[PDB]
Amino acid sequence: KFCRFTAEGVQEIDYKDIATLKNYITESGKIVPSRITGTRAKYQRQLARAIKRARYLSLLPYTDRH
Amino acid sequence: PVIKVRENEPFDVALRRFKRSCEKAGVLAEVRRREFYEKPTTERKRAKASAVKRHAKKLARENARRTRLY
Amino acid sequence: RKQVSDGVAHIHASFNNTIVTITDRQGNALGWATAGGSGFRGSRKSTPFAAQVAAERCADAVKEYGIKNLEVMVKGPGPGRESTIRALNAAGFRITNITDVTPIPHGCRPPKKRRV
Amino acid sequence: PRRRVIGQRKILPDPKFGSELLAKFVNILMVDGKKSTAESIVYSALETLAQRSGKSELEAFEVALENVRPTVEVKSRRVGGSTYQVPVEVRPVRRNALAMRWIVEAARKRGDKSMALRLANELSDAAENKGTAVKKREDVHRMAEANKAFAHY
RNA sequence: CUUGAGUCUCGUAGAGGGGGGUAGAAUUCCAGGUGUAGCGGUGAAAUGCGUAGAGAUCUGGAGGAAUACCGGUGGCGAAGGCGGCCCCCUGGACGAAGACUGACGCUCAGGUGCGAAAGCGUGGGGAGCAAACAGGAUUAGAUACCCUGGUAGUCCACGCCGUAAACGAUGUCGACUUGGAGGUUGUGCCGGCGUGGCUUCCGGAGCUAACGCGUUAAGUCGACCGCCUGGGGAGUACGGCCGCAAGGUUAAAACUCAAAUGAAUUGACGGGGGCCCGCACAAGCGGUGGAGCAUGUGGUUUAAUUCGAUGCAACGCGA
Ligand SMILES: [Mg+2]
Ligand SMILES: [Mg+2]
Ligand SMILES: [Mg+2]
Ligand SMILES: [Mg+2]
Ligand SMILES: [Mg+2]
Ligand SMILES: [Mg+2]
Ligand SMILES: [Mg+2]
Ligand SMILES: [Mg+2]
Ligand SMILES: [Mg+2]
Ligand SMILES: [Mg+2]
Ligand SMILES: [Mg+2]
Ligand SMILES: [Mg+2]
Ligand SMILES: [Mg+2]
Ligand SMILES: [Mg+2]
Ligand SMILES: [Mg+2]
Ligand SMILES: [Mg+2]
Ligand SMILES: [Mg+2]
Ligand SMILES: [Mg+2]
């Protein structure tokens, strides 16, 4: 549990911050549900939005079979 | 589910880690869900029915902790 | 005729059949075997035992290339996923990697449900 | 049955050799409760079997059982209208019963004159894998091996 | 006059809408390499594809459609509906501190607009899917279910259609009336205490024919609108209006029946589920059905072939 973005005073998840983003994607590049990491709903939507932006820039992979 | 075999690891342990990695991603679950078309009216219906039974069983489990069988 | 010593096994495990193709690292096939071509038809074709035989016949069919270590691609939902891999290990190959490469659309409309 | 209150029933060993295994052979060969009529067939056939192979009275019958005893059989089972024959290993007690039953049934459908010689002719053939009793054992084994893909539920 | 209604200031969340661009996975096709005998499909098959080299695997290219994971009885919208990512234009909702107008409201026949999918017209596009259609099965038949293919259509632009179990089967607005457990989105004070919006479930009084609803009422009231008067005939005919058409809307009567219907109750039944049992299967032994004869019955015959039993539970039965 323990949504980490509220405890860190986060206001945006900043798709450029790829170190944070890799803690929310599976080993196959799938976004981990907030039910598993205990993320708040508002920040989970920002998280999914940031991950997809990172995928478009080729910072993160869409899948494990690229 | 890309699995790398490690040194001094027996094959069965390596193979067992492959199942756990595949079942974690649910690749066989996605495929079976995708082999036939699901109408949007019936995917909403099965999602609605899955939520109601997870709710119903919880109250059935809660009320069992307030009930004695003998 | 030639030596490769490091090939890739592509298991095609479907609900109706299992196809095993052993290629090289470059994607060039050397030998192949199938559950249907291993003497099993109909109900027998879609069993894990049939897929295991397909692996045995595919390993032996590619025996003249001198493969020693083998990578594995597992594709499809068929029952013969794991049974084929274990038969490949028993054949005498050093399994380097095991990878699931099942195609998942992120796509096209699937066929309508069967009303059986 | 649905209850499982079935226990083993005591069988006396044969008088001339004290063999539990051979007494059951008499019982399987017995017809209409005529046990005396069947002991003479079994004893005179094994007397012939011993004098024809020189091994012994007892283990000459046993070496015939080794070549008739099945190791795996198929049980019918239907799933989608078509029946699946599922091979299953045969427990040691049923292995003897099937072997003795096959020998007796193969012997009865022979061409010899006396049943004692008719049985000894079939028992001797079992030693070198020739009679129709070992040919049914082969058929069961081949049928089980063909249906090996269905060795699951 | 300010409390209903509205405006301004600051910010918040959102698949709200319209236009444009773009990304990755996958399907299909095309060209080529490796390689050899099956592939595909089903309960089982066959049609079909394949030695003219398929399927499998790899490389490159084309094209269209939809946006896995996130994803959630989560969110937004009057409803229909809206789901990759980015930009532009744009609607609404909410919150906090005031200021401002000064009841400026609510409802609304006719009218106007929006309105899933299918369908229609014109011009494009066409991967996958798939009415029609064809073939193969299944079957007593099978104009179906299943399989192999496959055209309209599904996609885009514009225009029409204006109907849905368009449903919460619950018109809109306002007020009042115990609680609990949540979700989502603001906001103030110090994870704790509040206070707003939306939303899910349970439940009290009360109501209800009952099921159930229960501060998001189907409770207690007020304002206005729409609609109903037994079932069938029939949302049909005729007439009017609308539409390119398909049809839509408005909407009878003769005749006929004494019911039709809603909710719940007890049974029974289910090719519903669960748990058990029985020579019920399974595992075995021996039989019957074939032969001759005994015996009973049916039928026939006869003067009479006495009467009765005649699925299991009549037929070596009354006898
Ligand atoms: Mg199909
Ligand atoms: Mg009107
Ligand atoms: Mg349409
Ligand atoms: Mg058109
Ligand atoms: Mg056209
Ligand atoms: Mg079809
Ligand atoms: Mg609807
Ligand atoms: Mg609805
Ligand atoms: Mg209505
Ligand atoms: Mg309630
Ligand atoms: Mg009409
Ligand atoms: Mg008219
Ligand atoms: Mg039986
Ligand atoms: Mg007879
Ligand atoms: Mg009579
Ligand atoms: Mg009578
Ligand atoms: Mg009776
Ligand atoms: Mg009797």
Side-chain angles (χ1 to χ4, degrees):
Chain A
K1 304 288 102 175
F2 179 65
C3 180
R4 316 183 92 254
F5 289 98
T6 312
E8 277 139 26
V10 180
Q11 180 272 0
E12 288 299 324
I13 295 173
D14 209 4
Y15 64 96
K16 296 183 290 294
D17 199 346
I18 191 167
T20 306
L21 286 195
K22 293 182 183 293
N23 290 318
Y24 304 102
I25 61 162
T26 61
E27 289 155 19
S28 64
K30 292 169 60 156
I31 300 168
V32 173
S34 70
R35 182 180 63 83
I36 293 309
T37 61
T39 302
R40 298 294 296 163
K42 172 166 77 175
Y43 302 101
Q44 175 71 32
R45 302 195 298 274
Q46 281 168 353
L47 184 76
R49 198 169 306 123
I51 286 170
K52 290 160 193 199
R53 293 180 181 177
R55 287 167 166 178
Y56 168 76
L57 298 170
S58 191
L59 301 167
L60 282 173
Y62 294 91
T63 187
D64 63 358
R65 288 151 292 167
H66 271 298
Chain B
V2 172
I3 295 308
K4 316 267 163 159
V5 176
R6 303 194 263 260
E7 294 294 328
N8 295 116
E9 183 178 1
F11 179 69
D12 295 355
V13 168
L15 187 73
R16 199 262 178 277
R17 187 167 45 102
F18 178 67
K19 297 172 185 293
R20 206 60 196 73
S21 158
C22 280
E23 293 179 353
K24 194 179 185 71
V27 292
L28 294 174
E30 303 298 337
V31 164
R32 293 180 185 273
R33 195 181 44 75
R34 286 182 170 281
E35 55 173 317
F36 294 110
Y37 178 72
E38 182 65 26
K39 285 176 70 180
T41 185
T42 61
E43 65 183 1
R44 294 187 306 256
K45 199 183 57 166
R46 87 166 185 272
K48 182 80 173 181
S50 287
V52 68
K53 65 178 72 66
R54 83 164 63 244
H55 211 79
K57 291 174 71 175
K58 185 181 287 177
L59 282 72
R61 197 190 58 195
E62 288 287 331
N63 274 275
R65 284 199 267 192
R66 321 207 293 288
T67 310
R68 85 188 276 212
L69 277 296
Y70 56 93
Chain C
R1 296 285 179 268
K2 200 174 288 296
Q3 295 297 289
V4 285
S5 71
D6 200 307
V8 180
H10 309 258
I11 296 91
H12 188 97
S14 65
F15 292 125
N16 271 333
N17 197 11
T18 309
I19 306 176
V20 194
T21 300
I22 277 171
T23 64
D24 52 23
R25 298 294 296 163
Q26 287 69 240
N28 295 283
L30 314 177
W32 58 262
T34 68
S38 303
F40 298 114
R41 294 311 295 162
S43 300
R44 281 75 178 272
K45 198 171 59 139
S46 179
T47 62
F49 175 65
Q52 159 185 113
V53 175
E56 299 313 358
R57 284 169 102 249
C58 181
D60 181 290
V62 75
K63 182 175 73 175
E64 69 275 16
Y65 293 80
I67 304 106
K68 298 296 289 183
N69 52 5
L70 197 81
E71 203 200 311
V72 167
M73 305 303 183
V74 176
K75 165 192 302 211
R81 295 167 53 85
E82 85 288 6
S83 61
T84 300
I85 312 156
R86 314 193 66 141
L88 275 168
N89 184 89
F93 295 111
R94 168 75 61 183
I95 303 306
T96 297
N97 297 115
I98 305 171
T99 300
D100 168 59
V101 292
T102 307
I104 298 298
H106 287 175
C108 299
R109 197 170 162 119
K112 64 190 180 163
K113 293 182 183 293
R114 318 174 57 221
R115 299 182 304 283
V116 297
Chain D
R2 303 179 186 284
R3 290 328 296 252
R4 270 201 181 221
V5 176
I6 300 319
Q8 295 298 109
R9 183 178 287 114
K10 181 196 175 169
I11 182 167
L12 264 61
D14 44 4
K16 195 185 281 193
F17 307 111
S19 173
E20 283 265 325
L21 191 53
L22 196 54
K24 177 70 81 172
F25 196 67
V26 177
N27 284 356
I28 292 170
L29 193 67
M30 167 176 38
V31 173
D32 299 318
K34 285 147 96 63
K35 189 171 282 193
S36 66
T37 301
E39 299 162 9
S40 59
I41 294 174
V42 176
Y43 284 161
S44 59
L46 295 181
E47 188 64 27
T48 289
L49 181 71
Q51 65 183 357
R52 163 192 289 143
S53 70
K55 184 68 178 176
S56 176
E57 294 293 328
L58 186 64
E59 68 255 24
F61 169 63
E62 179 82 21
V63 293
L65 302 182
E66 307 297 349
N67 288 318
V68 187
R69 268 193 270 257
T71 51
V72 54
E73 68 183 358
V74 297
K75 303 186 294 201
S76 279
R77 183 178 182 270
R78 164 225 70 82
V79 172
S82 296
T83 300
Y84 294 98
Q85 310 261 337
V86 171
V88 292
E89 69 275 16
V90 179
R91 62 185 180 278
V93 184
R94 190 177 155 75
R95 290 162 62 111
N96 292 326
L98 282 171
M100 289 185 253
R101 190 186 314 146
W102 290 345
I103 279 156
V104 163
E105 82 187 13
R108 278 189 189 134
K109 65 178 72 66
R110 282 184 83 91
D112 280 16
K113 285 203 181 121
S114 87
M115 173 81 219
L117 183 63
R118 193 182 264 127
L119 181 69
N121 189 359
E122 179 59 59
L123 294 168
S124 284
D125 287 14
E128 67 275 17
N129 296 326
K130 191 60 65 177
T132 59
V134 308
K135 185 177 180 180
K136 184 166 173 63
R137 187 262 286 142
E138 277 175 308
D139 291 331
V140 172
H141 275 161
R142 296 161 52 261
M143 162 69 159
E145 186 65 27
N147 289 285
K148 165 157 179 188
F150 294 136
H152 295 318
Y153 278 3

